[PDB]
Amino acid sequence: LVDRDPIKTSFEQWAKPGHFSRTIAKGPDTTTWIWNLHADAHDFDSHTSDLEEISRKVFSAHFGQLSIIFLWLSGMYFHGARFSNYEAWLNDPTHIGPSAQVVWPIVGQEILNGDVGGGFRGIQITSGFFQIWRASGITSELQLYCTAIGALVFAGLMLFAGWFHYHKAAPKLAWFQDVESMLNHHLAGLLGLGSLSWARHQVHVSLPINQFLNAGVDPKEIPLPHEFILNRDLLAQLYPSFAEGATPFFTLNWSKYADFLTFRGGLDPLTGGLWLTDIAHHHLAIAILFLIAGHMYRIKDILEAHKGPFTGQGHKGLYEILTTSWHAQLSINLAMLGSLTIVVAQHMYSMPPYPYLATDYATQLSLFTHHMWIGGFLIVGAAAHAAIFMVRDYDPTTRYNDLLDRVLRHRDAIISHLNWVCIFLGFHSFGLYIHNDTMSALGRPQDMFSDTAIQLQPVFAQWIQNTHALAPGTTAPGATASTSLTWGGGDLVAVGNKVALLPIPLGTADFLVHHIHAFTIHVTVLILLKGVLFARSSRLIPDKANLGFRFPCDGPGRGGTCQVSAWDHVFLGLFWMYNSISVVIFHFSWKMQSDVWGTINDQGVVTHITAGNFAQSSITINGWLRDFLWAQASQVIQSYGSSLSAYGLFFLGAHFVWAFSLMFLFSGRGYWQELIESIVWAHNKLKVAPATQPRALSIVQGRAVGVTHYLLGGIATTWAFFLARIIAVG
Amino acid sequence: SDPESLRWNVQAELVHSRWAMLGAAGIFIPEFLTKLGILNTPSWYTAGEQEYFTDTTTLFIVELVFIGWAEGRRWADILNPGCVNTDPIFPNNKLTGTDVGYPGGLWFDPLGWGSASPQKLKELRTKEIKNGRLAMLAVMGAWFQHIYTGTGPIDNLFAAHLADPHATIFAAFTPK
Amino acid sequence: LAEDPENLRWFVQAELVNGRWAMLGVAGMLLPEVFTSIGIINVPKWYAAGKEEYFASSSTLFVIEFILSHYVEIRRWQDIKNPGSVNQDPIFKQYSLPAGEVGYPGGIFNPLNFAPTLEAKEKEIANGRLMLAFLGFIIQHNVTGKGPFDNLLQHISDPWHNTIVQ
Amino acid sequence: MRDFKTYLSVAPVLSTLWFGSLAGLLIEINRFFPDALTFPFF
Amino acid sequence: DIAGLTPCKESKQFAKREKQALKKLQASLKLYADDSAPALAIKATMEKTKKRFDNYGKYGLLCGSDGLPHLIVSGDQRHWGEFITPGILFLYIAGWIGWVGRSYLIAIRDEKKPTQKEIIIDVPLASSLLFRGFSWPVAAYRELLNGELVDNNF
Ligand code: CLA
Ligand code: CLA
Ligand SMILES: CC(=CC=C/C(C)=C/C=C/C=C(C)/C=C/C=C(C)/C=C/C1=C(C)CCCC1(C)C)/C=C/C1=C(C)CCCC1(C)C
Ligand SMILES: CC(=CC=C/C(C)=C/C=C/C=C(C)\C=C\C=C(C)\C=C\C1=C(C)CCCC1(C)C)/C=C/C1=C(C)CCCC1(C)C
Ligand SMILES: CC1=C(C/C=C(\C)CCC[C@H](C)CCC[C@@H](C)CCCC(C)C)C(=O)c2ccccc2C1=O
């Protein structure tokens, strides 16, 4: 370390066994430290006992994400370009069924490459470029081929800002350890100056270049590469060059107008992607705020303020150490970032924001479950990293007697409640279904819980849905339809290939899933809540912050003394959430196809991918493999010899990989030792082993190779199960 | 703050160099030489226009039986005797090292003054134009590029195309 | 331990038997080349004696000889663990007794010996290989061919043939 | 520059320039003979 | 010849496979490439699995019912190199994977501190002990069982 510290060598450290705590990787050989090294590679209890750097690394090794997201996207714009189908698909939507990727016909490959639209062999897409891409106030294949290198530009450069940190002799403390302004900036002008800037390049150019696309043409029979300058003459069709107004204000006359916007709500008949005549106004109406907003402020003051009786004395002082944490100001974030992603996953499917979605079924549910697993994979995290706080981050105990020191005060308490909450749920929240089986398999419907047997009567309606689609008669101005076409009141006519959204009815078989979610969302959180709370000390172990937030398990005593910790609460809390999301998905498509998705023809006699089979028959939790899993999936297990086939052909692996997790999840440890030697023996006889003491998995590594597999198994299983029942009918 | 960054053979890279480059000599002067309009013409009838082809891949064999032979003999007794094991003198060997070759065996050696010194003076000559030849040929090997790319009409491959003025290739000069 | 070799006995005798049988093997070919015309596999039979009986078979022939070769060969065994073969000119060579500056062990490179008059098992060294690798050669080229060298009319110049098999 | 009795080192995963490639040259034999399931010989 | 049927010289069931199945491949009356220069079902992918006509070579190859071809390899009638030919091959290749396993290993445990030289690699692949494998004529087939790895060391 020790090596040359000094002052006295540019000469870099390539060669001399080890580094990472101090009777380190020792001279003496071993393997464990090769999963060490990668694991905990990023961490901070080592590197130095002194903040300083760390924030000087994380602001750099951050960077290389943007740059990456940036090398990525490029190979997607390039891809969504010269491996074309976008040109072809756009003159010809409702019709196509898009591609970007294609094999090369090496070995078996080609089956994977199967006629997708504007006349070519390839593998489809459920990742709605070709639909952000509607945008292109321009169109052209080589063009995206500029947007593309425009991408690699931001990268190399927005990747030499990461040389232009840590490796360059760095900023320091004040720079972040004065926080005083940060959000001031961020939200004001980027949050703002994007949404803002996005406005300017969202009616300028895009609106017009799909105002007269929503009809016909073949591009360049429209939208030149410059055309949209000073020429405010084509902006003539889509409202005035302000005619006699000057910089809004009022001494304005309308005997017949009101600038672009003229607010919509509903859905283009010919392109139901929601109206764009709005899409400017809403982004404009954003930015303003941010534009005004990012103009606080300088900190404590506002939190150093409102206290009460039982309230939070420490509210006041809610962390000096919120300029001195990270692990704290990351975990907070993840809960939001994360919880603020799966709020996407709704406003999307019950309010499409891109031209051609809904009709495009599979190219926005992929979405609504990809976005859905982040608004969850980022939340258990958002707990883990709080545990990482709760255990260690600060130097000593300087933080004292406050909102927390409070919450903890009760702790065998906040989690005392929550518990019973769950068993109240569960009993009202799952055995509920099991009634049905036991009594519908007993069979007496009189007494089930059907949308019709237990008292509810051919209506759901009177709640709040029915006071949403109907609200354009309040303080409400209006604009034909609602806000989200899926609401109770009025309207039908949505689309001329297939369908899109319509009411979406409820009652029971909507009533009780909606409740299983409760109990599922709740017991998830119990285990993370109590997990992060009891982070450091307890009446099973108090001497219990003494290593780190991991540690395998304290020891055979006290009865059990194993799981405890909170790596592990963030190990069995993943375990749930994989359900939390994995059953919410299961919900949406079985609805969204049992009803909604389906299809018009004469007299628009609606014909769902399934005549609402849901009805009386998800209520039975077998119906959930009678009507689901065994019904759909018949497309997965038919999928051989085709074009997609890579799904069925995954769906066996990964429906294997999962069923390999249990081995990592379910087993001892001096076991594979006791085994690894028999091995090590046979090894020595030929003279072939010892060097680098081969060793079994690091108790908790073992759990690391559970879980992670159990998910990348149990998950892509459906990622396959899905793309295979929306491609092809649906 | 400056790379770390290398070598050591930093000593050997420099002798496929005098290999690569001197060598490009062979192409540089014979080409242009060629001999414009010699009088003229290039015609080779002789072993070549009637005995069923002459070479191509008996070409190589004979062709680099020799290069064969000689390129090997080239670096692998450039010099290095001692020629085995077992502790470090670095290059990745000099496991010849402290012994050149032989303790009083034969005339391993060239030349008096117990070494191999091809005398002291001659930095001249080959420091200059020669590790020139390295440099030179960088840019009239960057001519190889200019000299022909553009696959004289007789083929557009993967049709961008991508605009059009007029042709290109070689013979000397330039429109400009 | 046995630093290194070794061996000895070993497979130097290993060779000479290759050497001197690759030599013979090629006497095989020698024949059909001057006053030429008659060989390849020619799966002989192999020179074939009298007009007084065989007749396709009378017998496996071929199969026998080498039952014989067989105990004569145990015999050369019957030598090399423990040195016994009067002449004694393979196991090290003749020149009676000697060479075995490698019979009790300790070689490294050990060149050897063995003609009284005179010289050596040496330039019977290199007819030694010429012929092993020759065969390599010999039943290399069949698998497409079977004949050498005319004059400068139109032969030695390789005209057109036909892959490997493929 | 490398003579006799082992040489210079190399990284953690030069196996990722050994899985990719070498092995990679082998698709390169699995299209030259675009097919197997027995094989002619040479 | 053996349990399944005969090779390619005739195999009815096999024929039907050639034909429907692939050729439906077809299946696309057109699908546009009248002259067009990409969409390559058209040329080979079929013809490369196809011009594989009433020839595949000829390989014998037994072919059961549904006429997918079965592998006997019992060293008889025709089928010998469906295991041995590609069998010794598997042997020879491996073993010269681990002959050198027991090599860029038995070359270290010595000199000075040799305690993980192996997480980096001294000669990459060994590129020194390299050919020791093709430069196995006989080799371990004697010197493994006599000396070195000698029962001693056993
Ligand atoms: C803003 C977020 C983000 C950031 C910057 C971090 C940063 C950090 N986390 Mg963290 N974390 C996050 C989100 C984040 N996390 C989330 C959402 C969770 C919930 C799962 C966690 C759960 C978590 C735990 C339990 C731990 C950390 C730890 C850490 C620290 C260790 C980093 C490391 O060595 O990489 C770790 C990554 C590897 C070693 C790479 C292995 C990745 C495998 C599992 C592959 C994943 C599957 C994928 C499909 C495989 C690729 C495809 C393949 C099939 C080809 C580091 C400070 C660790 C710590 O000890 O604190 C100091 C502790 O282990 N995190
Ligand atoms: C060079 C290496 C080498 C050699 C000679 C062997 C040899 C052996 N192993 Mg083994 N093994 C190895 C590496 C090796 N292993 C590695 C890396 C692992 C992963 C931990 C194992 C895991 C393993 C297990 C679990 C078992 C064996 C067993 C055995 C024995 C049975 C052979 C068998 O069927 O397993 C086939 C061989 C493997 C599964 C090993 C995979 C690794 C190979 C591919 C190493 C390839 C070389 C590698 C790249 C080194 C780099 C080269 C370097 C010089 C630059 C045999 C003695 C079995 C036993 O004990 O019974 C006698 C037992 O079941 N091995
Ligand atoms: C520099 C600038 C700018 C700008 C502008 C800008 C600066 C803009 C920006 C914007 C931003 C944005 C617009 C954002 C975006 C984002 C995104 C797009 C993302 C997305 C996502 C999500 C959702 C999550 C994650 C994933 C992803 C990434 C996909 C300018 C400046 C200036 C100056 C000083 C001078 C004068 C002029 C001006 C102008 C005044
Ligand atoms: C047997 C095998 C395999 C298997 C396999 C299986 C049997 C399975 C696997 C699986 C894998 C995976 C699976 C991975 C992956 C992936 C991915 C890419 C994913 C993605 C995703 C995302 C993005 C997230 C979530 C969802 C998903 C999953 C979709 C192999 C074997 C072998 C041999 C003989 C020897 C040598 C080597 C090899 C050649 C290797
Ligand atoms: C199966 C199992 C094992 C045994 C699993 C092992 C030993 C997996 C590790 C195997 C390594 C990854 C093989 C690595 C070898 C190769 C990387 C070396 C050759 C390099 C390549 C070229 C092949 C545990 O150690 C364990 C520990 C704790 C709880 C549960 C379990 C558990 O369930």
Curated annotation (Swiss-Prot), chain A:
Q: Where does [4Fe-4S] cluster bind?
A: C553, C562
The subcellular location is: Plastid, Chloroplast thylakoid membrane
State its Enzyme Commission number(s).
Answer: 1.97.1.12
Identify the main location: plastid
Show the SUPFAM superfamilies listed in the entry. Answer: Photosystem I subunits PsaA/PsaB
Q: Sorted alphabetically, which PANTHER family does this protein's record hold? A: OUTER MEMBRANE PROTEIN, OMPA-RELATED, PHOTOSYSTEM I P700 CHLOROPHYLL A APOPROTEIN A1-RELATED
Family per record: Belongs to the PsaA/PsaB family.
Q: What does this protein do?
A: PsaA and PsaB bind P700, the primary electron donor of photosystem I (PSI), as well as the electron acceptors A0, A1 and FX. PSI is a plastocyanin-ferredoxin oxidoreductase, converting photonic excitation into a charge separation, which transfers an electron from the donor P700 chlorophyll pair to the spectroscopically characterized acceptors A0, A1, FX, FA and FB in turn. Oxidized P700 is reduced on the lumenal side of the thylakoid membrane by plastocyanin.
Tell me the protein's name. Answer: Photosystem I P700 chlorophyll a apoprotein A1
Gene source species? Pisum sativum
UniProtKB/Swiss-Prot annotation, chain C:
Query: Subcellular localization, per the record?
Result: Plastid, Chloroplast thylakoid membrane
For the ligand (chlorophyll a 4), the binding residues are: N127
Induction (free text): Down-regulated by UV-B.
Ordered alphabetically, the record's keywords are:
Chlorophyll, Chloroplast, Chromophore, Magnesium, Membrane, Metal-binding, Phosphoprotein, Photosynthesis, Photosystem I, Photosystem II, Plastid, Thylakoid, Transit peptide, Transmembrane, Transmembrane helix
Residues bound to chlorophyll a 1: E15, R129
Disulphide linkage map: none
Give the CC-aspect GO terms: chloroplast thylakoid membrane; photosystem I; photosystem II
The entry's chlorophyll a 6-binding residues are H155
What is the membrane topology here? Answer: Multi-pass membrane protein
Q: What biological processes does GO assign it?
A: photosynthesis, light harvesting
Give the Gene Ontology MF terms in alphabetical order.
chlorophyll binding; metal ion binding
At the top level, the lineage of the source is: Eukaryota
The residues that cross the membrane are 21-41, 54-74
What does the cofactor section's free text say about binding? Binds at least 14 chlorophylls (8 Chl-a and 6 Chl-b) and carotenoids such as lutein and neoxanthin.
Query: What is said about the domains?
Result: The N-terminus of the protein extends into the stroma where it is involved with adhesion of granal membranes and post-translational modifications; both are believed to mediate the distribution of excitation energy between photosystems I and II.
Q: How does it assemble?
A: The LHC complex consists of chlorophyll a-b binding proteins.
Functional description taken from the UniProt entry: The light-harvesting complex (LHC) functions as a light receptor, it captures and delivers excitation energy to photosystems with which it is closely associated. May channel protons produced in the catalytic Mn center of water oxidation into the thylakoid lumen.
By sequence similarity, the record places it as follows: Belongs to the light-harvesting chlorophyll a/b-binding (LHC) protein family.
Source organism per entry reads: Pisum sativum
In terms of the parent sequence, the fragment covers 81 to 247 of 252
From Swiss-Prot, chain D:
Q: Name one GO cellular component term.
A: chloroplast thylakoid membrane
Q: What InterPro entries does the annotation carry?
A: PSI_PsaJ, PSI_PsaJ_sf
Record's Pfam families? PSI_PsaJ (PF01701)
User: From what superkingdom does this record's organism come?
Assistant: Eukaryota
| Swiss-Prot/TrEMBL keywords | Chloroplast, Membrane, Photosynthesis, Photosystem I, Plastid, Thylakoid, Transmembrane, Transmembrane helix
What kind of membrane protein is this, topologically?
A: Single-pass membrane protein
Q: What is its main location?
A: plastid
Instruction: Give the UniProt record's GO annotations in the biological process aspect.
Output: photosynthesis
| Chain ranges passing through the membrane | 7-27
Where it sits in the cell: the answer is: Plastid, Chloroplast thylakoid membrane
Q: Does the keyword Cell membrane apply?
A: no
**Is Transmembrane among the key words of this record?**
yes
Explain the purpose of this protein: May help in the organization of the PsaE and PsaF subunits.
Q: Which family does it belong to?
A: Belongs to the PsaJ family.
Q: What is this protein called?
A: Photosystem I reaction center subunit IX
Source organism per UniProt: Spinacia oleracea
Q: What is the lineage of its organism?
A: Eukaryota, Viridiplantae, Streptophyta, Embryophyta, Tracheophyta
Curated annotation (Swiss-Prot), chain E:
**Example of a GO biological process term:** photosynthesis
Q: Where in the cell is it found?
A: Plastid, Chloroplast thylakoid lumen
- Membrane-crossing ranges are none
Keyword Protease on this protein?
A: no
Which key words tag this protein in UniProt?
A: Chloroplast, Photosynthesis, Photosystem I, Plastid, Thylakoid, Transit peptide
GO molecular function annotations of the record = phosphoprotein binding
GO cellular component terms attached to this protein's record: chloroplast thylakoid lumen; chloroplast thylakoid membrane; photosystem I reaction center
Role according to the record: Probably participates in efficiency of electron transfer from plastocyanin to P700 (or cytochrome c553 in algae and cyanobacteria). This plastocyanin-docking protein contributes to the specific association of plastocyanin to PSI.
**Family to which the UniProt record says this protein belongs:** Belongs to the PsaF family.
Q: What name does the UniProt record give this protein?
A: Photosystem I reaction center subunit III, chloroplastic
Q: Which gene encodes it?
A: PSAF
